[PDB]
Amino acid sequence: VDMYIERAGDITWEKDAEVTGNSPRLDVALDESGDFSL
Amino acid sequence: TTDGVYRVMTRRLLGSTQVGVGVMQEGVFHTMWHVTKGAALRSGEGRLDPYWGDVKQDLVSYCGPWKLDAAWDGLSEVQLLAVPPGERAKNIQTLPGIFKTKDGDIGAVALDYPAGTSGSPILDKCGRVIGLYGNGVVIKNGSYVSAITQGKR
Ligand SMILES: CN(C)Cc1ccc(C(=O)Nc2cc(Cl)cc(C(=O)NC(C)(C)CO)c2)[nH]1
Ligand code: NA
Numbered sequence: 577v578d579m580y581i582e583r584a585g586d587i588t589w590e591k592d593a594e595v596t597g598n599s600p601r602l603d604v605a606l607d608e609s610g611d612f613s614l
Numbered sequence: 615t616t617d618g619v620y621r622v623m624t625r626r627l628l629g630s631t632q633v634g635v636g637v638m639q640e641g642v643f644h645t646m647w648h649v650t651k652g653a654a655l656r657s658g659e660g661r662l663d664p665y666w667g668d669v670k671q672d673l674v675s676y677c678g679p680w681k682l683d684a685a686w687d688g689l690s691e692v693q694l695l696a697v698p699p700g701e702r703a704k705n706i707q708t709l710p711g712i713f714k715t716k717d718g719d720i721g722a723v724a725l726d727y728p729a730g731t732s733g734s735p736i737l738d739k740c741g742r743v744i745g746l747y748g749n750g751v752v753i754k755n756g757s758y759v760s761a762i763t764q765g766k767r
Contacts, residue, residue, distance in 0.1 A: 579633070580656035581620040585695065585703035587637065589741045593693055597708035597724045600759060604713040604751065610647070610672040612713065612751045612761060 615641060615657070619695055619703060619735060622649050632699035635733035637743055643676035645733040646748050646763070650674055672749040673765045680765035684742035686710060686721040692762075693737045694723055694747055699730040705737075713761055721762035723747055736762055 604612050615638065622634040622645060634649030643655065647667050652674060655662040667674035675681075686692065694706040710721035723736060725747070732748025750760035
């Protein structure tokens with residue numbers, strides 16, 4: 577078995593986390609292979 | 615098998631390489647199909663076997679059915695709990711955009727991380743997992759926009 581998992585953290589909301597990224601409204605297609613495109 | 619966020623690692627390539635990220639909740643490991651392609655996983659001396667998967671949703675669950683059922687409210691800021699290769703887990707807060715599809719609207723997070731970050735969980739203000747980051751599109755800039763990909767429970 578080639579693949580393995582390592583714990584990286586707890587799943588918690590962090591008050592006063594770094595706030596960034598934009599919020600685009602995009603027109604997309606989802607093909608049978610699970611690829612998104614514009 | 616403790617609840618939390620996990621790196622998915624392989625020793626097939628050079629050194630130890632991070633292929634992606636997943637979520638352990640209710641004894642089930644959750645990641646994106648393209649991270650593992652449905653392969654078995656090692657956990658200490660334990661082995662995790664795939665239970666459910668779908669290439670089109672790009673999700674897979676190990677040791678049981680998909681458990682994550684919370685949804686984006688369509689209104690509020692969320693946090694990406696990004697786990698980048700070789701770097702600490704880090705909460706990034708953002709307002710999702712939208713993917714408009716012929717079959718309805720999904721949340722979208724516009725944050726640039728390496729491909730090895732696929733499967734990082736997205737959180738609501740109560741800490742609940744509303745989906746996984748790491749399947750999406752490269753836009754004009756050269757930047758990445760991920761679906762908020764949630765399975766069915
Ligand atoms: C799921 N299958 C069928 C489709 C597929 C192939 C690849 C993907 C996919 O979404 N890959 C991916 C995931 C992530 Cl988290 C980041 C980047 C990325 O290129 N990020 C940059 C900021 C540009 C830095 O390299 C790319 N989906
Ligand atoms: Na396989």
